């Protein structure tokens, strides 16, 4: 075989993912990332229809928790949760909502960083 072990590359890639998550949680992005630090509080916000339209809520805090608990089998799985988070926002809010603009700015950060993970994501 030789070369690098697949389990090692996956771990390296998940480490890059952790670093991307850390980047997204930095104070630098606070102006447009804060709405995604925690789960959306439908109750406290009066969004009585949030869990109706959004079947799988997601947020940076939860993704951070799953990463810390070694729950992602690979980078694609991590990416899916990040995109789910943005998808939820685009689906629940009106296209012109201020939070949508913030999501897209934060997604600009994510996509540009994720894509620069050395080589291409392994399964």
């Amino acid at each position: 075989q030789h070369k690098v072990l697949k389990t090692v590359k996956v771990t390296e890639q998940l480490k890059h993912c952790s670093e991307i998550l850390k980047e997204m949680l930095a104070k630098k992005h606070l102006p447009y990332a804060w709405p995604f630090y925690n789960p959306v509080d439908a109750d406290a916000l009066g969004l009585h229809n949030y869990y109706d339209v959004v079947k799988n809520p997601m947020d940076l805090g939860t993704i951070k928790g799953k990463m810390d608990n070694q729950e992602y089998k690979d980078a694609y799985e991590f990416a899916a949760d990040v995109r789910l988070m943005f998808m939820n926002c685009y689906k629940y809010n009106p296209p012109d909502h201020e939070v949508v603009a913030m999501a897209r700015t934060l997604q600009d950060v994510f996509e540009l960083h994720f894509a620069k993970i050395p080589d291409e994501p392994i399964e």
Binding site: P35, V40, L45, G46, L47, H48, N49, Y50, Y92, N93, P94, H97, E98, V99
Partner: peptide, 7 residues
């Protein structure tokens, strides 16, 4: 319809 209000 409800709408989220960011602060």
């Amino acid at each position: 319809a409800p709408r989220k209000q960011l602060a």
